[PDB]
Amino acid sequence: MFAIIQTGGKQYRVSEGDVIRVESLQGEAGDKVELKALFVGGEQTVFGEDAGKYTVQAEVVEHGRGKKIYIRKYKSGVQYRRRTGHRQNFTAIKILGI
Amino acid sequence: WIQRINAGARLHGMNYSTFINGLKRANIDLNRKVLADIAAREPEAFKALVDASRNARQ
Amino acid sequence: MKGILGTKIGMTQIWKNDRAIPVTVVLAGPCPIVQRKTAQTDGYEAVQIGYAPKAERKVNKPMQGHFAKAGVAPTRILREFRGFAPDGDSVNVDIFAEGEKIDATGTSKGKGTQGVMKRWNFAGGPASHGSKKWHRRPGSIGQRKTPGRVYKGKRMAGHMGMERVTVQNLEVVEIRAGENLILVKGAIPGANGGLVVLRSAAKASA
Amino acid sequence: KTYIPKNDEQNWVVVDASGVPLGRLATLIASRIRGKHRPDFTPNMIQGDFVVVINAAQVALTGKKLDDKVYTRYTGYQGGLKTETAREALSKHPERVIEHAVFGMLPKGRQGRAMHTRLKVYAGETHPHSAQKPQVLKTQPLE
Amino acid sequence: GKQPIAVPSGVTVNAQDGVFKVKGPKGELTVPYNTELTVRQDGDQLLVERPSDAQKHRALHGLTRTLVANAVKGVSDGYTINLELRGVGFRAKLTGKALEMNIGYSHPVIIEPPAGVTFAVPEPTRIDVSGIDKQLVGQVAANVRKVRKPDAYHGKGVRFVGEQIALKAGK
RNA sequence: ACGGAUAACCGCUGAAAGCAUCUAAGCGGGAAGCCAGCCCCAAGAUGAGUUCUCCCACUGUUUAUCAGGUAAGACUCCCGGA
RNA sequence: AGGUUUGGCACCUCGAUGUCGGCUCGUCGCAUCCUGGGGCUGAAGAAGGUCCCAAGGGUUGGGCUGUUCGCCCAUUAAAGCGGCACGCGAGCUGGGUUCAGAACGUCGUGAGACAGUUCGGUCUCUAUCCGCUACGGGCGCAGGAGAAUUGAGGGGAGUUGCUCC
RNA sequence: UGUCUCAACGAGGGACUCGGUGAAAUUGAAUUGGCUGUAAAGAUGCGGCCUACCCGUAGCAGGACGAAAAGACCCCGUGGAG
Ligand SMILES: [Mg+2]
Ligand SMILES: [Mg+2]
Ligand SMILES: [Mg+2]
Ligand SMILES: [Mg+2]
Ligand SMILES: [Mg+2]
Ligand SMILES: [Mg+2]
Ligand SMILES: [Mg+2]
Ligand SMILES: [Mg+2]
Ligand SMILES: [Mg+2]
Ligand SMILES: [Mg+2]
Ligand SMILES: [Mg+2]
Ligand SMILES: [Mg+2]
Ligand SMILES: [Mg+2]
Ligand SMILES: [Mg+2]
Ligand SMILES: [Mg+2]
Ligand SMILES: [Mg+2]
Ligand SMILES: [Mg+2]
Ligand SMILES: [Mg+2]
Ligand SMILES: [Mg+2]
Ligand SMILES: [Mg+2]
Ligand SMILES: [Mg+2]
Ligand SMILES: [Mg+2]
Ligand SMILES: [Mg+2]
Ligand SMILES: [Mg+2]
Ligand SMILES: [Mg+2]
Ligand SMILES: [Mg+2]
Ligand SMILES: [Mg+2]
Ligand SMILES: [Mg+2]
Ligand SMILES: [Mg+2]
Ligand SMILES: [Mg+2]
Ligand SMILES: [Mg+2]
Ligand SMILES: [Mg+2]
Ligand SMILES: [Mg+2]
Ligand SMILES: [Mg+2]
Ligand SMILES: [Mg+2]
Ligand SMILES: [Mg+2]
Ligand SMILES: [Mg+2]
Ligand SMILES: [Mg+2]
Ligand SMILES: [Mg+2]
Ligand SMILES: [Mg+2]
Ligand SMILES: [Mg+2]
Ligand SMILES: [Mg+2]
Ligand SMILES: [Mg+2]
Ligand SMILES: [Mg+2]
Ligand SMILES: [Mg+2]
């Protein structure tokens, strides 16, 4: 049930990579430590900032670029077409934390 | 997500308006609506979130 | 109510106390009770009666066993009559009384694909003064854009005749019971040699 | 990443209708058939329930409605169709009344028509679907 | 149109629900009753009254009181309207349980009285309808009056016996 | 024709409004009109209905996995047809 | 109030939306000509007046005129009023007005003109889709077949006189 | 005297079926319904609601503001010609 929710995520999926908006944390150097809004790490769980007293560390895995996309804009009768390439970068992070 | 969340909320005698507000009143949980659904795939938890929202509301 | 099956034999001239009477001759040949429909079993009350015989060499096995369960020789023709509860087999004898009015059902003679004049009495266009709409040819079928379709049920060239048809309250002039002949006043639908049903006058007079 | 259930489940249910205002029993049946109850999961799938309305003849129609309500229907013919029935002419076929309300409160698409398959109405207090032993429902929710 | 009910010696009454059945000397009867009010104690004379000094109630106050009143007035006493044929050659006959109107139409007219209502005539030119229900005797007599309303110009028709009727000038 | 519910309308019972009132609860009467009744169509009513009768459990190894000989029964073809 | 008249305005249509009348075919409104039911009448009867309900069906044949109208003849229960591109020309006429000829009256010196009047004058064999009338092929309707059928629903029909009791 | 009330029957030549040869105008693309409403003011194509299984063949002409000719009327051009 682990959740990359929004930008910084808080859910119990022990031990796997997943993709995030980016970090600056070079290589594996990040070892980014994480908040925690609620996760079931042993059947039991909580939210009331008792999740905040927990935290999940995650090794960084690698930086990457998402799939290519073409932004395409058009409006009738007025000429006006627009083609423009785009793709958004990310950081892949492995999880290990409590 | 909204559909599923208040479906679960009504499973326990609440509703999206009521459950979402009471969760908001409880030291702001700030789970996404995505995330509250998935806990509508893990009923024992969503249940406690319902009891917790029902608290910060009595 | 009362019912029976027969063949249309033809129309002739007659007399009764010096009134010339056109009549149609009908063979209401004896009919057999092949099936009895209770409501308790088939949901409504009716009787399945048969008419023109045919040799069992021409009667396929399923129809054979149908007729066989009822104890009857195979019949080229079968029909139901609602609300009848006859006994034994349905002969025209006494089933109609002389001077009764009766509903005669038959099948219109098949006139093929008739135009509008024949079919719906159109009375199409003038034959001079200058057309190429002389013959049938309906005039308009609509009115410009206003609904901008042509009406459902519009009268148009089509297949005329071959319809089922009932003619009610024909009078029973005569009954030669031993011949299984029934003499009825006036015309009946369909061509000679055809099937026809005589039943009790459905719209009985007051 | 959102969960997308497979649906082995079939769910039979027995709604009584005596005295319930028609539109209200209608809305409860339409909701229970469309999904809604339980996490809806996919809109894509008809994962709602089979409803078995009974005593449809006894539906209340609060207000003047019993003889004001004029259901209207149109035969293709441009001879005047638009025949109309009083709803007091639910005596002719009460299930139609129920079945009409519900189909109004259902989607009108391919899947919606397909949903109408899940409604079974019987004007009497009896039905033949004993083989699915439907769960009883109540009729209204509480805050 | 309110006030206490009177209870004649040969009467009984039940206050269950809106039901109200009586078993007086001429037989049992029942009067439909709004249950928004409660039927009152039978200890001697009886009256029911409105919960509210509200507009909509006191109308039912009076209707309900008078209805139970007339129901008792019937079960204990009976009921019987009088009627007078009037006009040249107008008359009636009794034939079994039915009235035999004979008044100015090509076809003699008949009427079969709904249950519990007895036609009677003594003088051939006068009818009397006796019975238990007052609404029933009212509609029955109103039917026999329907057979011919007295005409404006000359007063031919069914009359009430006591019924004065002014007449239009003719010529 | 008969019948059911109605229109204008005509009435019974009847308060509000101690009288009266066809209406405010209730009830009856009432048209070539409405529903049904008459004739014709109709289960593609995909919600595809019901009943009587008929034929019956054939054959092919992990290779051809569904097809193939047949039943009951049709169809092609021939001679004709209000 | 309606939106059927004459109009205002100029909004789509000037790389075309054929216009009067007739014929043919229909169908709708109802503010009802007839029939059906009612109230009132200065309604005795009869014959009526007028208002309310009512749109099922019905609503004639000729003379004159291009006519629509309207007048007339002879009937009628009645001889209704309107919508539908003032319904309907890829359905017909082409009498009417909007082409070329020609004439009268009038206007213009003229060429020519018209509020006009008059005789004459090309109306385009093949339906793609939708809509309609008829008729088949396919599949479906949890085995394959032959017959008999309930009727959800849908269509047709629906006028009226005269005389006698 | 079939012009007509008022149309009938019959003939031939087409139209229909099979074998041979085989065009045309038109065509934004089309998986191209009804009512009502809305939209540049007359909707298959927008909205709501109804109806509707797939595909043909013979036929009718209401729609597709159907086809044909960049309206001949009308106005405009500091256009043309008799
Ligand atoms: Mg656009
Ligand atoms: Mg622009
Ligand atoms: Mg033939
Ligand atoms: Mg002709
Ligand atoms: Mg046209
Ligand atoms: Mg349209
Ligand atoms: Mg009174
Ligand atoms: Mg009434
Ligand atoms: Mg009645
Ligand atoms: Mg009649
Ligand atoms: Mg099925
Ligand atoms: Mg096989
Ligand atoms: Mg064989
Ligand atoms: Mg105008
Ligand atoms: Mg302007
Ligand atoms: Mg164009
Ligand atoms: Mg013009
Ligand atoms: Mg009116
Ligand atoms: Mg009258
Ligand atoms: Mg008179
Ligand atoms: Mg005339
Ligand atoms: Mg002459
Ligand atoms: Mg007209
Ligand atoms: Mg105009
Ligand atoms: Mg026109
Ligand atoms: Mg043309
Ligand atoms: Mg001309
Ligand atoms: Mg001069
Ligand atoms: Mg000439
Ligand atoms: Mg000419
Ligand atoms: Mg040709
Ligand atoms: Mg079988
Ligand atoms: Mg039916
Ligand atoms: Mg259908
Ligand atoms: Mg020929
Ligand atoms: Mg299609
Ligand atoms: Mg608008
Ligand atoms: Mg429109
Ligand atoms: Mg679209
Ligand atoms: Mg649309
Ligand atoms: Mg279908
Ligand atoms: Mg053609
Ligand atoms: Mg064009
Ligand atoms: Mg131009
Ligand atoms: Mg110049």
Curated annotation (Swiss-Prot), chain B:
Role: Binds directly to 23S rRNA, probably serving to organize its structure.
Subunit-structure text: Part of the 50S ribosomal subunit. Contacts proteins L13 and L21.
Family: Belongs to the bacterial ribosomal protein bL20 family.
Name of the protein: Large ribosomal subunit protein bL20
Organism: Deinococcus radiodurans (strain ATCC 13939 / DSM 20539 / JCM 16871 / CCUG 27074 / LMG 4051 / NBRC 15346 / NCIMB 9279 / VKM B-1422 / R1)
UniProtKB/Swiss-Prot annotation, chain C:
GO molecular function, one term: rRNA binding
Region (Disordered): 125-148
Gene Ontology cellular-component annotations: cytosolic large ribosomal subunit
Any one Pfam family match given in the protein's UniProt record, by short name: Ribosomal_L3
GO BP term (any one): translation
Record function comment: One of the primary rRNA binding proteins, it binds directly near the 3'-end of the 23S rRNA, where it nucleates assembly of the 50S subunit.
Oligomeric and partner information: Part of the 50S ribosomal subunit. Forms a cluster with proteins L14 and L19. Also contacts proteins L13 and L17.
PANTHER family reported for this sequence: 50S RIBOSOMAL PROTEIN L3, LARGE RIBOSOMAL SUBUNIT PROTEIN UL3C
Name this polypeptide is given: Large ribosomal subunit protein uL3
Curated annotation (Swiss-Prot), chain D:
Annotated GO CC locations: cytosolic large ribosomal subunit; ribosome
Keywords (A to Z) from UniProt: Ribonucleoprotein, Ribosomal protein, RNA-binding, rRNA-binding
Region (Disordered): 124-143
Superkingdom classification of source: Bacteria
Signal peptide interval: none
Quaternary state and interactors: Part of the 50S ribosomal subunit. Contacts proteins L3 and L20.
Record's function text: This protein is one of the early assembly proteins of the 50S ribosomal subunit. Binds to the 23S rRNA.
Protein name: Large ribosomal subunit protein uL13
Organism: Deinococcus radiodurans (strain ATCC 13939 / DSM 20539 / JCM 16871 / CCUG 27074 / LMG 4051 / NBRC 15346 / NCIMB 9279 / VKM B-1422 / R1)
Shown stretch of the complete protein: 30 to 172 of 174
UniProtKB/Swiss-Prot annotation, chain E:
UniProt KW keywords: Ribonucleoprotein, Ribosomal protein, RNA-binding, rRNA-binding
A Pfam family: Ribosomal_L6
UniProt-listed Gene3D superfamilies: Ribosomal protein L6, alpha-beta domain
GO terms for biological process, alphabetical: cytoplasmic translation
Gene Ontology annotations for the cellular component aspect, listed alphabetically: cytosolic large ribosomal subunit
Entries under InterPro entries matching the protein: Ribosomal_uL6-like, Ribosomal_uL6-like_a/b-dom_sf, Ribosomal_uL6_a/b-dom, Ribosomal_uL6_bac-type
Keyword Transferase found: no
Keyword Protease: no
Highest taxon listed in the record's lineage: Bacteria
Example GO molecular function: rRNA binding
HAMAP family (alphabetical): Ribosomal_uL6_B (MF_01365_B)
Assembly information from the UniProt record: Part of the 50S ribosomal subunit.
Function: It is located near the subunit interface in the base of the L7/L12 stalk, and near the tRNA binding site of the peptidyltransferase center. This protein binds to the 23S rRNA, and is important in its secondary structure.
Protein family: Belongs to the universal ribosomal protein uL6 family.
Alphabetical list of PANTHER family matching this protein: 60S/50S RIBOSOMAL PROTEIN L6/L9, LARGE RIBOSOMAL SUBUNIT PROTEIN UL6M
Protein's name in the database: Large ribosomal subunit protein uL6
